[PDB]
């Protein structure tokens, strides 16, 4: 079919260190895709991925010095824009998004991949508000030939990074992603970040370790999701709850949200 390979760049979706993310529309089919205009590790990692809660990779093309990544367009935008500052969002919406975030993270850890930069800016929503993990620019392989590799590279975003990354030379990959997921859960329920970074010098972090939950952001969060956050935001990564155990948590299994409203008559 002629012109089926032609895409029009209609608008700017985002901007990173690399460059830009553009919304591309097919000339014939009008199919919408996101084009990332920038790397070798990101493409190789994206080629491994296939899951309903992970942004799809369609292919890549290099036009000299410029690399074009063809990725899934998520019309719902960023999770970040669903969080109302200092309020959050309704608890059933947060629970549904956290379930979907957990499905994506289990998938990635199962194939030996750690994202290393989970935050609401990187969590995108489709037309049906389904959460999709995006941006594998900082991602790495932590398990190969069923052998775990300890990480030492400090990366991510300080309000979301686990305390071991700042204190220890080496650390396990999986508890690091679990921690950042608990900070996302905190942001969704209180509309604010608990600390600038998880260090003893940070007063807000010291208050948390001293269980001063009568202070913000903790006082805005119900006791059931707050009991889960007490298990996730644990300083020792060896004592920190694992995802199989998050799946058995009381709040995680609490019925709260109704399914998407279907048309009906009386
Ligand atoms: O002017 C406003 C509207 C445009 C913009 N919309 C935000 C936004 C809206 C949508 C998207 C993205 C961002 C990134 C993205 C989007 N869909 N897909 C991808 C993607 C990135 C990496 O892999 C895929 C905010 C400012």
UniProtKB/Swiss-Prot annotation:
Catalytic-site annotation from UniProt: 117
Activity regulation info: Activated through phosphorylation predominantly by ATR but also by ATM in response to DNA damage or inhibition of DNA replication. Activation is modulated by several mediators including CLSPN, BRCA1 and FEM1B. Proteolytic cleavage at the C-terminus by SPRTN during normal DNA replication activates the protein kinase activity.
Segments forming domain Protein kinase: 7-252
Enzyme class of the recorded protein, top EC level: transferase
Annotated keywords: ATP-binding, Cell cycle, Chromosome, Cytoplasm, Cytoskeleton, Disease variant, DNA damage, DNA repair, Isopeptide bond, Kinase, Nucleotide-binding, Nucleus, Phosphoprotein, Serine/threonine-protein kinase, Transferase, Ubl conjugation
Region entry Interaction with CLSPN, spans: 1-252
Catalytic activity: L-seryl-[protein] + ATP = O-phospho-L-seryl-[protein] + ADP + H(+); L-threonyl-[protein] + ATP = O-phospho-L-threonyl-[protein] + ADP + H(+)
UniProt effect for mutating residue 119 to R: Strong reduction of chromatin-associated CHK1 ubiquitination
E.C. numbers: 2.7.11.1
Tissue: Expressed ubiquitously with the most abundant expression in thymus, testis, small intestine and colon.
GO CC terms: centrosome; chromatin; condensed nuclear chromosome; cytoplasm; cytosol; extracellular space; intracellular membrane-bounded organelle; nucleoplasm
A molecular function GO annotation: ATP binding
Cross-link entry Glycyl lysine isopeptide (Lys-Gly) (interchain with G-Cter in ubiquitin), positions: 119
Keyword hit for Zinc: no
Result when mutating residue 36 to R: Abolishes kinase activity
Compartments where located: Nucleus; Chromosome; Cytoplasm; Cytoplasm, Cytoskeleton, Microtubule organizing center, Centrosome
Disease: Oocyte/zygote/embryo maturation arrest 21: An autosomal dominant, female infertility disorder characterized by zygote development arrest due to failure of pronuclei fusion.
The record's note on its domains: The autoinhibitory region (AIR) inhibits the activity of the kinase domain.
Family the entry assigns: Belongs to the protein kinase superfamily. CAMK Ser/Thr protein kinase family. NIM1 subfamily.
Protein task: Serine/threonine-protein kinase which is required for checkpoint-mediated cell cycle arrest and activation of DNA repair in response to the presence of DNA damage or unreplicated DNA. May also negatively regulate cell cycle progression during unperturbed cell cycles. This regulation is achieved by a number of mechanisms that together help to preserve the integrity of the genome. Recognizes the substrate consensus sequence [R-X-X-S/T]. Binds to and phosphorylates CDC25A, CDC25B and CDC25C.
Listed name of the protein: Serine/threonine-protein kinase Chk1
Species, as recorded: Homo sapiens
Organism classification: Eukaryota, Metazoa, Chordata, Craniata, Vertebrata
Full-protein positions shown: 3 to 279 of 476
């Amino acid at each position: 079919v002629p012109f089926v390979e032609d895409w029009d760049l209609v608008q700017t979706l985002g901007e990173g260190a690399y460059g830009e993310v553009q919304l591309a529309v097919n000339r014939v089919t009008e199919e919408a895709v996101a084009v990332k205009i920038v790397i070798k590790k990101e493409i190789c990692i994206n080629k491994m991925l296939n899951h309903e809660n992970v942004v799809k990779f369609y292919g890549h093309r290099r036009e000299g010095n410029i690399q074009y990544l063809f990725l899934e367009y998520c019309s719902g935008g960023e999770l970040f824009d669903r969080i109302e500052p200092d309020i959050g969002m309704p608890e059933p919406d947060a629970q549904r998004f956290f379930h979907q975030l957990m499905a994506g993270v289990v998938y990635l850890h199962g194939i030996g991949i750690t994202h290393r930069d989970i935050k609401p800016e990187n969590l995108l929503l489709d037309e049906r508000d389904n959460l999709k993990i995006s941006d594998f620019g900082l991602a790495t392989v932590f398990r190969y030939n069923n052998r775990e590799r300890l990480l030492n590279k400090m990366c991510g975003t300080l309000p979301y990074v686990a305390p071991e990354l700042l204190k220890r030379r080496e650390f396990h990959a999986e508890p690091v992603d679990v921690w950042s997921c608990g900070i996302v859960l905190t942001a969704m329920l209180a509309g604010e970040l608990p600390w600038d970074q998880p260090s003893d010098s940070c007063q807000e972090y010291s208050d948390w370790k001293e269980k001063k939950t009568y202070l913000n952001p903790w006082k805005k969060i119900d006791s059931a999701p707050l009991a889960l956050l007490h298990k996730i935001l644990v300083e020792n990564p060896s004592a920190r709850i694992t995802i199989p155990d998050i799946k058995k948590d009381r709040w995680y299994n609490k019925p709260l949200k109704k399914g998407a409203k279907r048309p009906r008559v009386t």
